[PDB]
Amino acid sequence: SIERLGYLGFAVKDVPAWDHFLTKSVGLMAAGSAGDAALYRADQRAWRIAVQPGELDDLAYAGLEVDDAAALERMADKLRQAGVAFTRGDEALMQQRKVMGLLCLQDPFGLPLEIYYGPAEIFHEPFLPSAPVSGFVTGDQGIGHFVRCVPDTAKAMAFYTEVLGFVLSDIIDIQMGPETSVPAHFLHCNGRHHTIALAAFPIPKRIHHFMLQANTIDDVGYAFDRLDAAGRITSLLGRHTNDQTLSFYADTPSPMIEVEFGWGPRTVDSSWTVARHSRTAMWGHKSV
Amino acid sequence: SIERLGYLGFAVKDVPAWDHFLTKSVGLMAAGSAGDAALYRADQRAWRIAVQPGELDDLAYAGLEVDDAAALERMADKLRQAGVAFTRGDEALMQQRKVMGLLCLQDPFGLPLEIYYGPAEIFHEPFLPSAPVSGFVTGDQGIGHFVRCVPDTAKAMAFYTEVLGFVLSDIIDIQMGPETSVPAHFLHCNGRHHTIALAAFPIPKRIHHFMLQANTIDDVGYAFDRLDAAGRITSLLGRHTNDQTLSFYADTPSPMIEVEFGWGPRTVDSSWTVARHSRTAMWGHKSV
Amino acid sequence: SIERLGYLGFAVKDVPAWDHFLTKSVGLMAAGSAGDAALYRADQRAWRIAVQPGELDDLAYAGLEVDDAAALERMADKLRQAGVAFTRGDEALMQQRKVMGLLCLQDPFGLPLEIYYGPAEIFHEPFLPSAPVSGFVTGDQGIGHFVRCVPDTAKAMAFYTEVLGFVLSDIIDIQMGPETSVPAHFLHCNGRHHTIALAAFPIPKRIHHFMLQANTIDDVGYAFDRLDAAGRITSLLGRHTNDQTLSFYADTPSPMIEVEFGWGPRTVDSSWTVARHSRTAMWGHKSV
Amino acid sequence: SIERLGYLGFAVKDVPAWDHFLTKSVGLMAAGSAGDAALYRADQRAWRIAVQPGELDDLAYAGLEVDDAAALERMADKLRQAGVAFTRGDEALMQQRKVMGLLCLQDPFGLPLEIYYGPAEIFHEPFLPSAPVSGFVTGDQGIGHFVRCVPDTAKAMAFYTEVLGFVLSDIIDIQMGPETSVPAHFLHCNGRHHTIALAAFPIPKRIHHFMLQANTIDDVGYAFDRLDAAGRITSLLGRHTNDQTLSFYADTPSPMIEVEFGWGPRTVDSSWTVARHSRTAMWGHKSV
Amino acid sequence: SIERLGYLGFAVKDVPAWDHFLTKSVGLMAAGSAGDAALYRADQRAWRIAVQPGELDDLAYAGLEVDDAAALERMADKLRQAGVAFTRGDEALMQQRKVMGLLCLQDPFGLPLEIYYGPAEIFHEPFLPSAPVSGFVTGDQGIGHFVRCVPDTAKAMAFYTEVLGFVLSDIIDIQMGPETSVPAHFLHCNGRHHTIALAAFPIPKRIHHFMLQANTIDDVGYAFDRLDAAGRITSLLGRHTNDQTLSFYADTPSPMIEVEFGWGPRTVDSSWTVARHSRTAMWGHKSV
Amino acid sequence: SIERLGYLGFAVKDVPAWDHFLTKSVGLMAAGSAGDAALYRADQRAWRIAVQPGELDDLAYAGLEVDDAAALERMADKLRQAGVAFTRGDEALMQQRKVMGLLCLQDPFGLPLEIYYGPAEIFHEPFLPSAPVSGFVTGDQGIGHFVRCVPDTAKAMAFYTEVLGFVLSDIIDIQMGPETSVPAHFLHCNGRHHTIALAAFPIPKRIHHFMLQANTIDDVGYAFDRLDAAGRITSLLGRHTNDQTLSFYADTPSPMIEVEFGWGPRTVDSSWTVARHSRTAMWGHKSV
Ligand SMILES: Oc1cccc(-c2ccccc2)c1O
Ligand SMILES: Oc1cccc(-c2ccccc2)c1O
Ligand SMILES: Oc1cccc(-c2ccccc2)c1O
Ligand SMILES: Oc1cccc(-c2ccccc2)c1O
Ligand SMILES: Oc1cccc(-c2ccccc2)c1O
Ligand SMILES: Oc1cccc(-c2ccccc2)c1O
Ligand SMILES: [Fe+2]
Ligand SMILES: [Fe+2]
Ligand SMILES: [Fe+2]
Numbered sequence A, B, C, D, E, F: 001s002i003e004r005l006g007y008l009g010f011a012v013k014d015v016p017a018w019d020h021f022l023t024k025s026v027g028l029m030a031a032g033s034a035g036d037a038a039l040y041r042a043d044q045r046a047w048r049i050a051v052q053p054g055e056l057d058d059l060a061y062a063g064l065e066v067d068d069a070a071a072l073e074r075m076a077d078k079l080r081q082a083g084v085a086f087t088r089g090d091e092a093l094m095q096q097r098k099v100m101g102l103l104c105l106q107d108p109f110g111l112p113l114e115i116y117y118g119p120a121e122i123f124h125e126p127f128l129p130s131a132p133v134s135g136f137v138t139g140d141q142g143i144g145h146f147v148r149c150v151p152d153t154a155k156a157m158a159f160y161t162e163v164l165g166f167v168l169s170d171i172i173d174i175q176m177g178p179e180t181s182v183p184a185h186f187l188h189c190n191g192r193h194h195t196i197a198l199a200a201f202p203i204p205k206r207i208h209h210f211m212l213q214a215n216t217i218d219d220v221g222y223a224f225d226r227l228d229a230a231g232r233i234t235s236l237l238g239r240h241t242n243d244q245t246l247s248f249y250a251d252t253p254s255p256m257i258e259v260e261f262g263w264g265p266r267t268v269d270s271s272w273t274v275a276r277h278s279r280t281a282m283w284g285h286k287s288v
């Protein structure tokens, strides 16, 4: 099974806007380029987020990490047994992604996924944020999370759990209208309360948002002011009912895709219990 | 196997007396109603104790929790293999209990049991006690415990251990007369020393008492005075030989059913050793 | 100023009853005799409590400790400046008390006080309780406390504070009748919330009670049962409003003198604030 | 497999000498009698050591504990599969030992062993030592250890490891003469470095010594002086090479059987490594 | 599988130079001799490094430790199943090495390996360094590590992982020339980030270096000055990218074999993730 | 006032015996020589103990340390005010002692004392013991203590307390005969329970012993065996009543002067209370 989410690649219409957004606002470190993709770092990894020009203005792919070569072969075995098509990344792709091996596939609804192992690290070029942020929480919990929009949650759940090995943490019925709600399913594959959430939202994007977790509450408070100065805030500060992450949301330069910047959630372990919530926030998160 | 005791439902002759008892005396939070049942909270769960009008003046049902949907199906499998009759709760029942799924059955002596998963939580309506209590110890250990009266302890033991997966912690020979004692069996299904105790007591109730655990010794001391002002104390403060819970007992408004309010017991783990005790109290607990 | 209360001497009508009481019930260690006085230990000191035959059935004297020879001379100076009569204990008395020096005086109402330094310790004869008690809290806080009955609290306060250097911690208005209360003044001379309390009670004894503090809550719980078996309990368990000591009271063999056996109070330091309380117990302590 | 050593029974020629030895010298608590056996406690168990009159002047039996009824049946299964004869203790024996069930057998060289579960505890009669000792280290590690004398170490090893489930910790070549040593094998069945050691010593006793572990270094220091006053010291203080227990040895009233009284050893876990030592002491333990 | 690296034996042209090097410079304790081999200690083991005269000027053998006799037989089984030739060490060899049993074999490229259990410890002769070093980090992590030079890394990897049970931690592409690098593979068999690294270096030695880990940073700083006074420094202080060991390198008296003396690395556990690095040092380690 | 004891100088008949004693037995580090004095280290100081040839076979001088130049002038002022003769050490003496300034005087009974400030430290030559000892406890508590023999304790007390600023910790009545004891006075000048003890012993030496404190209990245990192998033990292990130091005594090569090697005492602070003890040992210390 997948151990963690390791990287995200976006294809966007305004690369310079995304560059400024990820560095000056979010605080990531510019890390050069690979082909036509600009690279950004959040820690010791050579890169965590890639941005390339494209009309999609959406997530182009997500990198799903396993711990070793044997693990990758076991994932290939699971894909075969499940009847899910995949192709082994060639040398050129391996060099582009800076990984020792990868399998290329798509989830049931067209999102390209890359399962890999052996990512490149560059401790000789220590991480230096582009904006005031003490650091990000990554490590064994991966880069963060994202909310995957799907037309059929049941179908998506079977794939992510039965094929990829994610596990359901909980469900929140997100109110959409006076008498309409969407049952968002939050999935984990490590200690991070969720790495992927599945939701049947009526937005035309592959994802609703991606999330990064900072080391301190001040990191979040300061980031809010930066994104507010940029005119991008979409929610006030708040704390989630399920993971207890204290965060705020803001627009990325790609319409209808947001970023969530948070701190201090609960983590999960083998004794986790599935529960249901009627609200996304215990407090705050008022839409603006 | 059952992971923890999650809820209790009582059917009583004096609903207002029970309402005052659970709130003003015990300290639970009033949490509205579901049908003809008044609901009470002890933590983030939508409800923990339900009270409905009825001539029983007894425990009407107990909710036994598992961690996920797959776990519930495994319990259904165990019930089938054991020849124990059960029915799947319908949508109406699921909505009434605020759970994602449940199996309805009875123990060998008529106590209705409900095995469920996916309970509702309401962190947006933080718990607020109705009386001075810093909080209750629940979480992975569930709501508390209860002593189940049975006519045949051996038969009850086989069901709770072999079918439901509870495990014997220890036995206390509770003296009843000059030369008569009842071997009470204390069972765990998690870290709580016991969640259910089995005893062949000569009382006409399904249970002898239910127990709630508070966060501090002062919580217990203060609760004693509240219940004493209500004229309900049945024991002085004391500490148990087996779980080392420091508690007192008091009458509920239903004749012959007591409540135990305690603090600071030992917890169990895989290295627990079965032992036998000749007394229920290491000190205190004098009957009054 | 006085550093701590170090010893107590009682003159009683039933020495054997007191012997059994202090050892089998309270848990002190029998430590031989000095003249016609039986000696009892609570720690490394050669003795802490002395019991001698006498019709008083009361506290005969209290030993007030200072840290060195120079300190004792300074106390002699304070007594002289205050016009309080005193005599230096002779060699025989010094040997009897096992101290390097002492001043003999009385408080304004006839209670003999002995200010001393250099007490004897016997670490080669380690303390062994006569009943199950993990140990007592003494050290820099001394042996415990006692409530001194006085006819004139103002006069007593001036002596204990201005002459001996005790400091007021707080006051409790102890209800005596429907519209009658006694303002008990609690005084400290170290970290122990109080070492001496002053109160105008209508009892014919020099003191209302003496108090010993044990290391654990179980120590207290077990002691309660022992004293209850002896038929001596005067209060249920409870916790004080001012020092937060969790204790119970019981009769000593001397009529109208009680013992208090407690655990876990707050301690004081230079930042202590004088306050007033309307009750002696935050919870419990019901009279029996 | 055996979880821990729970009790020892001795048959001796001088019961009063053993009584004084275990209480006044070692510090155990006298705990009445069961038949012609005097009982002694070291903790919450109803008894840990039994002494009965007999010409053996040796260990009469050792109680080997398992955690539950199912565990005991599994041990019966292992004995059957191994061809080791055993008899189930009858009701009278169960009542005598204060256990819920037991299997009676002998090791390959005649030492009676009793495998049991469900021992009686008496927390309402808290442990009170007969001599100054803060307490003993028992719990999951059992009462202590003993060195079993055997004529054939290989044969003894196969039985204790293959049948009873003990595991080798290490070996010490104990020098007997100028060019003669005995390879003592130290075996564990829990965190205690060893519960039983096997050695081909030329003494006519079933065991060389039994060992008790106290809570503090002072406990050991004080016990040394007590046993020295009794004229029983056989070694000066010292510390073992293998378990790092700091102890001393002394004669019991039974010729050639010693007691070891120690503190502060290392404990073992799954990552333990078998090693060999050429000396029993890292320092001290000079024979006297 | 192998649990840890326990000992190293060198065959050298200048025994006196090696003796001075290991004692006065590195700080090991001289521990006598066994045959024509001089012995050196780093902890409680009778020996850790052996030096004997020989033209090789290289590592003569490496001792690979397992936890018990059964483990050794399992390793013999693995060797048989893998078709790897081995011989059981005879009594003379066992006595020479001070072990309870061993298997003698070679890795695919001629390095003699000895798999053993039951090493001798001498706690009665406590370790005393020959130079100022607070101590070495050994224990469950073994003596240290070494970099094994191999002509075929793939072949070496299959043997060390598939046969001996080592596990890949990570890979570093060590730059050799302007457009030439060697993929060094770092392998663990316990918490030590690596115990053996495999690299296709163009040096004529079996190993590139061996490494010892000291308790403090000062240990390393002081050792640097000692080796610098001896004219042996080959690198400045630095910290590795993969294990985060802070160290320096120096020449041993055998040409082209170095020693690494370090402190403070990260350790590994079951959740370790394979990664790739482009540099050996996060900082420092400049060649001199 | 004196801050701590910093150094000791001995004049002895057998320098080689003392050299072996201090290094191979006690564990001090040989530190060259200054004139005809051999120097020994216990920590970062250039020297702590000096040994020179002389018929005295006794302590020749003791170095008493203050924190700065101003402090030394204040001590000169106190000596003048007290009428105690002293001479300022000249440049040659300052260079010999490796100090920035010193005052030379004698105590009332002829022991030369040197009050100094600014001692030399040599961190570039880190301490390396000559025998297995993890280290000594020095720092702000100085090198250790010594027992000063005096003919008139009262006179000695006035000088050490009134002139030098030492403070009485406690008194022990050391039994000399059936009805004879000597009141030993233990004095502190920092956290070390005592730095100098005064006693009217009938020995012809300036001191009874000097004491060094090691970091661990094993340090003490190992040192005992070393001194026992040398045939120098004068007491078994034991623990003192007053400072709770766990130690043993041994003869130095100078007749009637002993060394005490200990661990783990209590320390003193401003809240220390003067007490009296009837024994030097709580346990152990039997004379041999
Ligand atoms: O991390 C999270 C935890 C809980 C809910 C959301 C969420 C809120 C609104 C829309 C979609 C998801 C979330 O992002
Ligand atoms: O929690 C508990 C632990 C031990 C005994 C009891 C008990 C006491 C009297 C009657 C029934 C049970 C109990 O409630
Ligand atoms: O320690 C104490 C703290 C507060 C009140 C009392 C007290 C209660 C009743 C009568 C007299 C004193 C006391 O003893
Ligand atoms: O606990 C122990 C640990 C190591 C050795 C012994 C031992 C010493 C002498 C004779 C027999 C055993 C021991 O008792
Ligand atoms: O411990 C280590 C960790 C990482 C790299 C090296 C290394 C550096 C240069 C040449 C060979 C190995 C190493 O020794
Ligand atoms: O450190 C110490 C603490 C207490 C007593 C002594 C002592 C014992 C015998 C003779 C002289 C002194 C001592 O050395
Ligand atoms: Fe989110
Ligand atoms: Fe209960
Ligand atoms: Fe009181």
Ligand SMILES: [Fe+2]
Binding pocket: D145, D147, D209, D211, D260
């Ligand atoms: Fe032993």
Ligand SMILES: [Fe+2]
Binding pocket: E145, E147, E209, E211, E260
């Ligand atoms: Fe290395």
Ligand SMILES: [Fe+2]
Binding pocket: F145, F147, F209, F211, F260
């Ligand atoms: Fe001393």
